[PDB]
Amino acid sequence: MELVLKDAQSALTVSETTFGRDFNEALVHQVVVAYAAGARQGTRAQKTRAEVTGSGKKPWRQKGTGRARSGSIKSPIWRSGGVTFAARPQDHSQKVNKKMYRGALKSILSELVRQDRLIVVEKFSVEAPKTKLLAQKLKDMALEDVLIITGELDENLFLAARNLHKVDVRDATGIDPVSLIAFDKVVMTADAVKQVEEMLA
């Protein structure tokens, strides 16, 4: 469709299918959950009765005592040693089909356009690597929680936005569904949009 600009009011051409498709709630949710799971590292491990320090000696003989039958001090029902099902270090990453991942991005991009959370502008650069310049260039635009998605990574822009936490700068390649949804506004560049069109296809 046509993407209205706010500064040049220059027409932009974008494939209807990849920016006007319905919003697949179920597909987007599954991708977001998958992305969150992939972020984990599963760095957790416990010790079962086998791995607990101690010995296999029976604390007392197995009959005649007026006490319950015990086999070792490492039993899970015993203090200081146990854990019936000790955790192991495991990966929580989930496979997501390439088409499913691409389909989700198209749905999110379509939704953002509909909710006018996506703004297309011309080149967005800073003459010097100073955070003030970036802050001023956003205050006049009335943007507080924005994702500066640029066609090419620029060191001056990258350094300027590094300190700011509500402002994040990324390349088209470095985009994830979670970041796109989380950030209140996303401002693209003409080149960034063009490269998004082709690699989405």
């Binding site: 007392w60 005649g64 005592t65 007026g66 006490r67």
Partner: peptide, 17 residues
């Protein structure tokens, strides 16, 4: 607070045979 270590052998039971 050590639990009793030495438990004596039980007294032999009366022969019910």
């Amino acid at each position: 607070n050590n639990r009793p270590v030495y438990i004596p052998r039980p007294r032999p039971p009366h022969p019910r045979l």
